[PDB]
Design a protein around this ligand. Structure first.
Ligand SMILES: *C(=N)[C@H](C[C@@H]1CCNC1=O)NC(=O)[C@H](Cc1ccc(Cl)c(Cl)c1)NC(=O)[C@@H](NC(=O)NC(C)(C)C)C(C)(C)C
Ligand SMILES: *C(=N)[C@H](C[C@@H]1CCNC1=O)NC(=O)[C@H](Cc1ccc(Cl)c(Cl)c1)NC(=O)[C@@H](NC(=O)NC(C)(C)C)C(C)(C)C
Lengths: 306, 306
């Protein structure tokens, strides 16, 4: 029993983190085979950030302008290129600890583990969700750029996020590992702000199923509702609409607990309208939306990785 | 900016987990140098648990009754002994991935990372605190026994917890790595229940400092209080008393924010008496007590490990 914000084991990723220095700027890089991936803003000075032409900035660099360190070993940079907003540094040595991996662009609502790093050295791991407004609510300090987000599927590391910047509201923005930003953000210092965020409805329902599995039943009721009646209520409270695909995804949890999805929706509708009234669910006094249906299955069934 | 429930990177510990089978029971073991540590209840059958004599049970086993697997390699057991409630299996091979490590018995209020494992394989990592009643609020399923809790200090892994059992309220009990239970629990199936829990006051104050560092100031006020006036209020709300040592530990956070500890205490006193009134702090609608002062410093200053 029990339910925690659980991250993936980070060992396979720790062995791929390196330090990258260009000029006075040091941040983190991801070393896979003979390529080091890092944010391209590493090549900028303070004067360039207002409107950088990255093609010009890169053509004026040479391979020896890039200092790449793996622990105490210096890696020799033999090539460099740019893909969207990531820099790819080719090095003379293939990382012997390269895991089986793939690169994946995730959707809002999905969750992943972040390995927060400073100077190439792992500092901590935590779980977060890609919000509907394409930011993440992370924890990052100076020097954390190039830290990556990932999932593990059996034996395979899926990299989905590389950290680039913090926005004025204190939330975070970055790219997939092919250098495409999530959301409307760009790597030039111009006025940018996150759009309004919404609550990830399918995840709240997953978490209410987790509560039932763990013995929290006080919010259940005998009613049922329809998708369209539920969604009319969800919209008013700034919740994402529920689709038939969401219903199907929750199937395994409905089956294990015996409570129909549309039954659970009537409970959520009541909680939205009357509040939780000084009660808690799974130790929380707010409805939690950063667990996917798969997170709940994994943690309430016991899936491992090799 | 930002603030998350952050666990330590787990790579150094993943390489020490093995699977241990005795009879029909399989659980996890910790392989360091040429010794595998695991809960001694692995040697029990269902009939023995009501009142096991572990000395008798162990004398009737031989080295080949213990099946120890590291991935796909079988490790050959060449000796076995018991230390308190842990079994130590001597094996013919020293773990080449043994980190620099030590064994530490922690105090209530301290936090640590748990690497949850099934069949020797890491499943997830999360952070928790050893409660004042010597339980932890973990997340564990069948087969998780022998999963360990740890901290990292520079380059050294400090093991502090090995998982043995779940109590009827859904919380968890285990031993240090020398086999001594935390709390009044014993490994015989008899009626046992956790004592009443209290809230870890010094940790709540640390977390209120974290909130200030991240821009949540609405709960501050101009007042100050005394230790003895604060503690009189804390007692009524089932909070641990605050000592002068607690005050000193919070020094670094007081200094970075400019708010005296006893100033912060007057804010907490107000929050206890009037509630948070539908407001949140660091995204929570309850006062959080599972971050130590050191956790906050580490996450709001950026300490890494090598
Ligand atoms: C990366 N090592 C570091 C991580 C930051 C520090 C605090 N929290 C974090 O997540 N980020 C940077 O160095 C980054 C460089 C940069 C500047 C400008 C642009 Cl457009 C990009 Cl894509 C990257 N700086 C910042 O994140 C910066 N924020 C902004 O400048 N944001 C706007 C205004 C461009 C939206 C600070 C947080 C002010 C350092
Ligand atoms: C270990 N692999 C497993 C982990 C459990 C499963 C569910 N959640 C967990 O944390 N634990 C056990 O196999 C354990 C064996 C055992 C039995 C009896 C005693 Cl005294 C000890 Cl120290 C260990 N069983 C249990 O944890 C058991 N709980 C109790 O029997 N608890 C009391 C009544 C002895 C307090 C179940 C949770 C019922 C399986």
């Amino acid at each position: 029993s029990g339910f925690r914000k659980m991250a993936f084991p980070s060992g396979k990723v720790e062995g791929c983190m390196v330090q990258v220095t260009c000029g006075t700027t040091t941040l983190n890089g991801l070393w896979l085979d003979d390529v080091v991936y890092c944010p391209r803003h590493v090549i900028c000075t303070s004067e360039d950030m207002l409107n950088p032409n990255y093609e010009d900035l890169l053509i004026r660099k040479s391979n020896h302008n890039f200092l790449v360190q793996a622990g105490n070993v210096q890696l020799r940079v033999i090539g460099h290129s740019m893909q969207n907003c990531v820099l790819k540094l080719k090095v003379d040595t293939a990382n012997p600890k390269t895991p089986k991996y793939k690169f994946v662009r995730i959707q809002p609502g999905q969750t992943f583990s972040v390995l927060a790093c400073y100077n190439g050295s792992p500092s901590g791991v935590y779980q977060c969700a890609m919000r509907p407004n394409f930011t993440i609510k992370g924890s990052f300090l100076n020097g954390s750029c190039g830290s990556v987000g990932f999932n593990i599927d059996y034996d395979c590391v899926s990299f989905c996020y590389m950290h680039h910047m913090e926005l004025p509201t204190g939330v975070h923005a970055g790219t997939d590992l092919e250098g495409n930003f999530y959301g409307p953000f760009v790597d030039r210092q111009t006025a940018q702000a996150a759009g309004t965020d919404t609550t990830i409805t399918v995840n709240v329902l997953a978490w209410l199923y987790a509560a039932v599995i763990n013995g929290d039943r006080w919010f259940l009721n005998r009613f049922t509702t329809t998708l369209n009646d539920f969604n009319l209520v969800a919209m008013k409270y700034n919740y994402e609409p529920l689709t038939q695909d969401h219903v199907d995804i929750l199937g395994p949890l409905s089956a294990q607990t015996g409570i129909a999805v549309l039954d659970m929706c009537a409970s959520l509708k009541e909680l939205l309208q009357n509040g939780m009234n000084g009660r808690t669910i799974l130790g929380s006094a707010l409805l939690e939306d950063e667990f996917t249906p798969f997170d709940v299955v994994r943690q309430c069934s016991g899936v491992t990785f090799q």
